Design a protein around this ligand. Sequence first.
Ligand code: NET
Length: 286
Amino acid sequence: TSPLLAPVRQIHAFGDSYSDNGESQRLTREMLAKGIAGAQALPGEVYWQGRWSNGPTAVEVLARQLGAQLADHAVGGAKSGADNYYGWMSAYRHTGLAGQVDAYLATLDGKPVDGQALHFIFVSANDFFEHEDFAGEQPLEQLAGSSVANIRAAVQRLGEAGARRFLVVSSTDLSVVPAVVAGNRVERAQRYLQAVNASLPIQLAALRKTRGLELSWFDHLTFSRHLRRNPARYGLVELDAPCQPTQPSVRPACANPDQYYFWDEWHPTRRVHQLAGEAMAARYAR
Ligand SMILES: CC[N+](CC)(CC)CC
């Protein structure tokens, strides 16, 4: 192993429902109040304090582990580009990664980016879920290429403004998500996630060297494959059923959520987020 990276006191997180700690809730309340067409209260009533899970997301755990403050800009539904899985948000706010980065840079008044802050990026799942649910026309390989380009452009734009430290999360294992299984879309997910995860870290290692960045790559797929091959070691019992079914309708939650991998048909439980955030903290000194 290599030397641990330097300690972290501030995180700025960008991403989707795997990171959101209340922005989708706040923003959809704002949109409902203004009567925006098609708005829905997200995430909904069978979720914990606005997170798309039954507890803190992995980046919240990561911040606790590292002794860092967290500014969490992630929005549930966020795509790698400007917009969201929810198309009805675009006429109000651009909540994709590109839009989160634009809003972060616009809310420093001109006051500098913190060169010591860790810029955490965790996105791409909604590029695939939007494409499958609404019959997108890109071949999956072109979709993956657009996801990688969008993430690299976000790191480039944050670096241009003065960011120096990053942690980018790979695609998750979309191929075991319950909604993907139920859609009979396992092979498509495998092909998508393998294309992103082969290309992205090669692109980010070139950008890290050019711009003199500290950029760590977290392989969520390796992480999940190890937990799901050895579930008992981690106190997991149920790897496929959601603890809290929502499709086609809401049904009562399981009694033992700490023994489940999935909270709903897309998102992991607090237990898996906890393990993920501990794993992400492994490259860093406290
Ligand atoms: C973005 C939110 N989801 C689709 C409806 C995940 C893709 C789940 C509720």
